[PDB]
Design a protein around this nucleic acid. Structure first.
Ligand SMILES: [Mg+2]
Ligand SMILES: [Mg+2]
Ligand SMILES: [Mg+2]
Ligand SMILES: [Mg+2]
Ligand SMILES: [Mg+2]
Ligand SMILES: [Mg+2]
Ligand SMILES: [Mg+2]
Ligand SMILES: [Mg+2]
Ligand SMILES: [Mg+2]
Ligand SMILES: [Mg+2]
Ligand SMILES: [Mg+2]
Ligand SMILES: [Mg+2]
Ligand SMILES: [Mg+2]
Ligand SMILES: [Mg+2]
Ligand SMILES: [Mg+2]
Ligand SMILES: [Mg+2]
Ligand SMILES: [Mg+2]
Ligand SMILES: [Mg+2]
Ligand SMILES: [Mg+2]
Ligand SMILES: [Mg+2]
Ligand SMILES: [Mg+2]
Ligand SMILES: [Mg+2]
Ligand SMILES: [Mg+2]
Ligand SMILES: [Mg+2]
Ligand SMILES: [Mg+2]
Ligand SMILES: [Mg+2]
Ligand SMILES: [Mg+2]
Ligand SMILES: [Mg+2]
Ligand SMILES: [Mg+2]
Ligand SMILES: [Mg+2]
Ligand SMILES: [Mg+2]
Ligand SMILES: [Mg+2]
Ligand SMILES: [Mg+2]
Ligand SMILES: [Mg+2]
Ligand SMILES: [Mg+2]
Ligand SMILES: [Mg+2]
Ligand SMILES: [Mg+2]
Ligand SMILES: [Mg+2]
Ligand SMILES: [Mg+2]
Ligand SMILES: [Mg+2]
Ligand SMILES: [Mg+2]
Ligand SMILES: [Mg+2]
Ligand SMILES: [Mg+2]
Ligand SMILES: [Mg+2]
Ligand SMILES: [Mg+2]
Ligand SMILES: [Mg+2]
Ligand SMILES: [Mg+2]
Ligand SMILES: [Mg+2]
Ligand SMILES: [Mg+2]
Ligand SMILES: [Mg+2]
Ligand SMILES: [Mg+2]
Ligand SMILES: [Mg+2]
Ligand SMILES: [Mg+2]
Ligand SMILES: [Mg+2]
Ligand SMILES: [Mg+2]
Ligand SMILES: [Mg+2]
Ligand SMILES: [Mg+2]
Ligand SMILES: [Mg+2]
Ligand SMILES: [Mg+2]
Ligand SMILES: [Mg+2]
Ligand SMILES: [Mg+2]
Ligand SMILES: [Mg+2]
Ligand SMILES: [Mg+2]
Ligand SMILES: [Mg+2]
Ligand SMILES: [Mg+2]
Ligand SMILES: [Mg+2]
Ligand SMILES: [Mg+2]
Ligand SMILES: [Mg+2]
Ligand SMILES: [Mg+2]
Ligand SMILES: [Mg+2]
Ligand SMILES: [Mg+2]
Ligand SMILES: [Mg+2]
Ligand SMILES: [Mg+2]
Ligand SMILES: [Mg+2]
Ligand SMILES: [Mg+2]
Ligand SMILES: [Mg+2]
Ligand SMILES: [Mg+2]
Ligand SMILES: [Mg+2]
Ligand SMILES: [Mg+2]
Ligand SMILES: [Mg+2]
Ligand SMILES: [Mg+2]
Ligand SMILES: [Mg+2]
Ligand SMILES: [Mg+2]
Ligand SMILES: [Mg+2]
Ligand SMILES: [Mg+2]
Ligand SMILES: [Mg+2]
Ligand SMILES: [Mg+2]
Ligand SMILES: [Mg+2]
Ligand SMILES: [Mg+2]
Ligand SMILES: [Mg+2]
Ligand SMILES: [Mg+2]
Ligand SMILES: [Mg+2]
Ligand SMILES: [Mg+2]
Ligand SMILES: [Mg+2]
Ligand SMILES: [Zn+2]
Lengths: 118, 204, 137, 73, 59, 122
RNA sequence: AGUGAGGGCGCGAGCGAUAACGUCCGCGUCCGAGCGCGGGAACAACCGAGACCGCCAGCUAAGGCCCCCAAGUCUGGGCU
RNA sequence: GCACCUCGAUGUCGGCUCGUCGCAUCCUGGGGCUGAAGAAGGUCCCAAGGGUUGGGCUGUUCGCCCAUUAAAGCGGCACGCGAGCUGGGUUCAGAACGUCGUGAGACAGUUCGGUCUCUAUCCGCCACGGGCGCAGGAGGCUUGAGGGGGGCUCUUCCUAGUACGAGAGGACCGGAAGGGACGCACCUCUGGUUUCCCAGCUGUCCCUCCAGGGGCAUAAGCUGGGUAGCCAUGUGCGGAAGGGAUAACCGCUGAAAGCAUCUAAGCGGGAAGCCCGCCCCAAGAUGAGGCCUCCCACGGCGUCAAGCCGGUAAGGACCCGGGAAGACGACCCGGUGGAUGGGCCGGGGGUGUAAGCGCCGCGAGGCGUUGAGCCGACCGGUCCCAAUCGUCCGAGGUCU
């Protein structure tokens, strides 16, 4: 059973799966686009969404909230001062995922890209 | 054998004569007829009832043609209330008076591949005292060289639930004809959203 | 077809409003309708409310009360007709939603742990006494 | 008619034979109430023989005690 | 476990009989609306990096 | 809930202090006893010169549980201990007083005497 | 040379319990070695019968002749 | 007893798990007789549908006992079940007592210890798909041959303290209510869980000194709580009513045999049993059923192949977004003429007063801002993101 349960397991434990969503965020934000496996991507899209949407709030509290995960003060500045005001007019949906044609050789992992929109 | 299609919306208790009563609510009406069975043309009596409007932008030629003859816009699904022939062109919730007892059929929840413990309520092994990996196992399934086989219908692990099950003689508690609702003393099978058949009971 | 609202709609006809707000730690006194033999009457159960499990009309609460050496907890459906009234005897500053721990506490300890909630007491005797004022004549 | 005889598997040593052989015996003499078990030797029959023998001896000395608590009394 | 074991060499027929279902299905491709080179559907074209008629992946 | 081996405080002056249930009577194989049900229980300790002795097999009726009992009115009630009251075969209470409240369930069950003597129904 | 575990069935005896698909002798028989053929549903040794090879010929044996299944739903007389 | 299969191995007791059959019936159902007033009880007859408790002792089967019960039935199934578990017992090596033996050793004498083997090929069984068939092609809705499930029972009350009885006692029939056990479903209640939903805490390392936070202490560090979901201890509901054919049995009518006879012609009553009825599966029911509705002329000819081709029809499939569906397949919804998922917003709910700043206190802190902050699933809303665009299969209906 599993009925009506959101959120994936990704063959990781709690301690781990969380760091994943973070380092995946930290990378996505510092690069604007990254390539990951399909399901790893579909989880990540929600994560950076709340983070960014949070930075749209701009306040120091919100900033201290995002800081909890992103940890890097420098990155967080970039998120607030440059990433977010670009998204002021948009409400939710700051993230785009798209499946890639080439799976990766070593294991036939279907791939996809994840990027911030314009 | 009056009846109607509906959707199990949810449960919630109410109060009556200072007693609390567990109630599962069921969105019932309206249900337009689509075809009437008749011994002359069908070999028996029943009625094909529609429920929940369909988007004509999804209907196909064979279905639309069926719907046209009955003279009624598209609908989500059809089920037959056997041996019941209504005079109205639409069966409403009105057919049930608070007090009446009813049988409710609904597709049960789906446990998927289930263990013999959850399915058949087998005892399983002990959790201790030397049990080598059979803590939930079904144990013995037969004898020896006679019969030299396992009989049919041996209780064993498989898919549990997600199947038709009718719950008998349930009390109609209430009717909200203006909302097309229907209240029922007890618990109805399937999930909050499932298809259901409410029907006149067969107990005396 | 908001089945949610449908259910809450069904409930609406059984919803009460006449009841005071209260939080765990507050000491209350439910007047309950009971039946001794055949007759109807009112019985006052007064104790600390140790939990509230909110859930719309179906919300309920547990009151705990020592009674002749025996501790008794009792669970009341908040919107039952068998509740004539609920009087707030004394409001207290809890710290968590489920005061279960006081199941195992000396009265001296319950006392020290659940002190009087000055704010909600002050605001209570400020308001309502402000409502006694407004409806002059 | 008033004997109740039970057979069951003996206790202690014997290998597989002792495990699959209701060789032990128990006789209940319903009128009095005295009971004798016997899992001496391997044959059930011989054990019934002994038990039936002691059972007799035990009823006898019961009636002997009875006729004493009558005579002296 | 008392270590179960095949009682008879599986017949050459019954072997392949099992492998009845093992043959694979070809890939599903569409012509890319841009180049008309073949791509799996719902994926970004490897040739040009065009999807939804818009440019994305640089290639 | 009170199965065999369950202990209970006696809620009266029969001299018994704590009895262990050995059989719930309500039924030919019932799992558990609750408020109002009768259990055969054994006396596991008692006070000097009491009426009933220690180790007497006795009958008693459960007047309080730690497992909350439901009521038709939607309410429920739970005490802090499992308690009962020693009775004879005619189901009269053997004592004369009874301490600590009892559940109103007892009244319905027709235990009218026990209910009255109790210093509070709840 | 091989054999020197024999077996079944009928009959005559002992043993056994006027039990045993028991045992042990005698006479006989077949199986053994005829698990080749027909009958007895099936069945080593019961009934018929001793297969050199061929045949899209014939008569019989046992056992059968209503259908599975070859041949009488044959004739005459009784009983159930 | 025999020694016919198995010694190039057929694992032996008891327990546990799962049972299934027999009827010589323990209970409940029906009945005859009774030394049957009644309530009982005895014995026999019918009946295998269901039911047939929990503990003390012992490895124990057996048995004894405790408390119940309608009853605590007896057997078969390699004294069912060790490629299902156990390993207390038995049956290796150690060791000891009694005992026998000069002894080494030995004991249906006892005692303490003592390795039970991850992979299922076939049959069988529980589930679930792929192919093909269903002599036009499709979409829906069905019929019930056949099969499975279920099948228990107590107690009180009324009738009525009536018939019966000296009394104590105490019914038939008919009606009522509350129980136990079991089955199915369910999450409103009650109650669990809720691996990051909120909070508090210790140590330590880190960011950025304060403050605020982060990793780690489990694969949640610990603790206090906890929606949705899955659940029982929680909730509803089931066993039926009823119809038909019967068993033992009770009768009518009635010869053979002037009378009598329940039977030989013929007829009525009669069971928890049988057949229906209830629930579930079900047209591979190859005997492939039935109703409703949709689709169209083969386009070239195949000589013999009663079809060889190939774009289309109605429709279906792929792919994608998903799902109280699910191991995989399958099934269900949705795919821009769209709210399927994600985000966002709302509600619900959990936590229980964030941070920051102000105030009081030397301080630990407190108080205010403040039911604040955070806020997973549930109920909704919203095209911001993602189901883009596309591809493939599929009639053209053999005969009397
Ligand atoms: Mg793996
Ligand atoms: Mg957060
Ligand atoms: Mg690659
Ligand atoms: Mg449809
Ligand atoms: Mg069970
Ligand atoms: Mg279970
Ligand atoms: Mg072990
Ligand atoms: Mg929904
Ligand atoms: Mg109190
Ligand atoms: Mg007030
Ligand atoms: Mg004021
Ligand atoms: Mg015996
Ligand atoms: Mg005696
Ligand atoms: Mg395949
Ligand atoms: Mg007490
Ligand atoms: Mg139970
Ligand atoms: Mg003592
Ligand atoms: Mg009550
Ligand atoms: Mg007295
Ligand atoms: Mg009474
Ligand atoms: Mg009383
Ligand atoms: Mg009183
Ligand atoms: Mg020689
Ligand atoms: Mg003779
Ligand atoms: Mg010869
Ligand atoms: Mg030879
Ligand atoms: Mg021959
Ligand atoms: Mg031969
Ligand atoms: Mg002949
Ligand atoms: Mg002849
Ligand atoms: Mg003549
Ligand atoms: Mg021999
Ligand atoms: Mg053999
Ligand atoms: Mg054998
Ligand atoms: Mg058994
Ligand atoms: Mg009796
Ligand atoms: Mg008897
Ligand atoms: Mg007799
Ligand atoms: Mg003990
Ligand atoms: Mg023991
Ligand atoms: Mg021992
Ligand atoms: Mg009885
Ligand atoms: Mg008895
Ligand atoms: Mg008895
Ligand atoms: Mg017995
Ligand atoms: Mg047996
Ligand atoms: Mg031992
Ligand atoms: Mg041993
Ligand atoms: Mg050994
Ligand atoms: Mg041995
Ligand atoms: Mg030894
Ligand atoms: Mg010697
Ligand atoms: Mg010596
Ligand atoms: Mg000497
Ligand atoms: Mg012995
Ligand atoms: Mg030993
Ligand atoms: Mg391994
Ligand atoms: Mg067809
Ligand atoms: Mg078909
Ligand atoms: Mg049928
Ligand atoms: Mg049937
Ligand atoms: Mg009288
Ligand atoms: Mg009368
Ligand atoms: Mg009387
Ligand atoms: Mg998170
Ligand atoms: Mg710091
Ligand atoms: Mg801090
Ligand atoms: Mg929950
Ligand atoms: Mg239960
Ligand atoms: Mg019931
Ligand atoms: Mg009736
Ligand atoms: Mg009948
Ligand atoms: Mg007959
Ligand atoms: Mg007969
Ligand atoms: Mg008579
Ligand atoms: Mg009659
Ligand atoms: Mg007559
Ligand atoms: Mg006559
Ligand atoms: Mg006459
Ligand atoms: Mg008749
Ligand atoms: Mg029949
Ligand atoms: Mg039917
Ligand atoms: Mg069906
Ligand atoms: Mg069909
Ligand atoms: Mg032409
Ligand atoms: Mg030619
Ligand atoms: Mg899909
Ligand atoms: Mg907001
Ligand atoms: Mg709140
Ligand atoms: Mg905080
Ligand atoms: Mg909210
Ligand atoms: Mg989350
Ligand atoms: Mg969310
Ligand atoms: Mg969701
Ligand atoms: Zn291209």
């Amino acid at each position: 059973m599993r009925h009506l349960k959101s959120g994936r397991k990704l063959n990781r434990h709690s301690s781990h799966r969380l760091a994943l969503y973070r380092n995946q965020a930290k990378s996505l934000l510092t690069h604007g686009r990254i390539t990951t496996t399909v399901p790893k991507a579909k989880e990540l899209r929600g994560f950076v969404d709340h983070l960014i949407h949070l930075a749209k709030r701009g306040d120091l509290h919100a900033r201290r909230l995002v800081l909890r995960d992103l940890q890097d003060v420098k990155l967080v500045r970039k998120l607030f001062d440059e990433i977010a005001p670009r998204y002021r007019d948009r409400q939710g949906g700051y993230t785009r995922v798209l499946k890639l044609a080439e799976r990766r050789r070593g294991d036939g992992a279907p791939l996809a890209l994840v990027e911030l929109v314009e | 054998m009056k009846g109607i299609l509906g959707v199990k919306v949810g449960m919630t208790r109410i109060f009556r004569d200072d007693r609390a009563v567990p109630v599962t609510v069921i969105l019932a009406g309206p249900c337009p007829v689509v075809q009437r069975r008749t011994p002359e043309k069908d070999g028996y009596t029943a009625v094909q009832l529609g429920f929940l409007p369909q988007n004509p932008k999804r209907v196909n030629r064979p279905l639309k043609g069926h719907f046209a003859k009955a003279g009624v816009e598209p609908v989500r699904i059809l089920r037959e209330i056997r041996d019941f022939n209504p005079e109205g062109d639409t069966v409403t919730v009105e057919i049930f008076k608070p007090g009446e007892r009813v049988d409710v059929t609904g597709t049960s929840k789906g446990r998927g591949f289930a263990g013999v413990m959850k399915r058949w309520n087998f005892a399983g092994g002990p959790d201790s005292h030397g049990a080598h990996k059979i803590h939930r196992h079904p144990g013995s399934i037969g004898n020896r060289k006679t019969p030299g086989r396992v009989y049919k219908g041996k209780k064993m692990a498989g898919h549990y639930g997600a199947e038709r099950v009718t719950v008998m003689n349930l009390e109609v508690v209430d009717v909200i004809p203006e909302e097309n609702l229907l209240l029922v003393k007890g618990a109805v099978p399937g999930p909050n959203g499932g298809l259901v058949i409410v029907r006149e009971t067969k107990k005396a | 077809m908001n089945r949610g609202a449908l259910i809450k709609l069904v409930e609406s006809r059984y919803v009460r409003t006449d009841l005071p707000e209260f939080r765990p730690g507050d000491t209350v006194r439910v007047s309950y309708k009971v039946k001794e033999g055949n007759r109807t009457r009112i019985q006052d159960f007064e104790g600390i409310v140790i939990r509230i499990r909110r859930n719309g009309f179906n919300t309920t609460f547990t009151v705990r009360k020592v009674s002749y050496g025996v501790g008794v907890e009792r669970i009341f459906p908040l919107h039952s007709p068998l509740i004539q009234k609920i009087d707030i005897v004394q409001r207290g500053r809890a710290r968590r939603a489920k005061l279960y721990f006081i199941r195992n506490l000396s009265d001296r300890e319950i006392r020290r742990k659940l002190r009087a909630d000055r704010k909600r007491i002050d605001k209570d005797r400020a308001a309502e006494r402000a409502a006694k004022e407004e409806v002059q004549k | 008619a008033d004997l109740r005889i039970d057979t069951f598997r003996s206790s202690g040593a014997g290998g597989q034979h002792v495990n699959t052989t209701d060789s032990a015996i128990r006789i209940t003499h319903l009128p009095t109430g005295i009971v004798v078990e016997c899992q001496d030797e391997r044959s059930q029959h011989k054990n019934k023989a002994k038990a039936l023998s002691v059972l007799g001896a035990r009823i006898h000395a019961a009636e002997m005690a009875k006729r004493q608590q009558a005579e002296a009394s | 476990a008392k270590h179960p074991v095949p009682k008879k060499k599986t017949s050459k027929a019954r072997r392949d009989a099992r492998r009845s279902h093992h043959a694979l299905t070809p890939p599903i491709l569409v012509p890319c609306p841009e180049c008309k080179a073949m791509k799996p559907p719902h994926t970004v074209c490897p040739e040009c990096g065009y999807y939804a008629g818009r440019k994305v992946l640089e290639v | 809930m009170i199965q065999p081996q369950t202990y209970l405080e006696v809620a009266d002056n029969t001299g018994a202090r704590k009895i262990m249930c050995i059989r719930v009577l309500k039924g030919s194989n019932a799992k558990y006893a609750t408020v109002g049900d009768v259990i055969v229980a054994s006396v596991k300790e008692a006070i000097p010169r009491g009426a009933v002795k220690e180790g007497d097999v006795v009958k008693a009726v459960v007047v309080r549980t730690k497992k909350e009992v439901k009521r038709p009115d939607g309410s429920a009630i739970r005490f802090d201990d499992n308690a009962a009251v020693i009775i004879n075969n005619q189901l009269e209470p053997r004592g004369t007083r009874v301490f600590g409240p009892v559940a109103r369930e007892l009244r319905e069950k027709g235990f009218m005497k026990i209910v009255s003597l109790a210093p509070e129904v709840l």
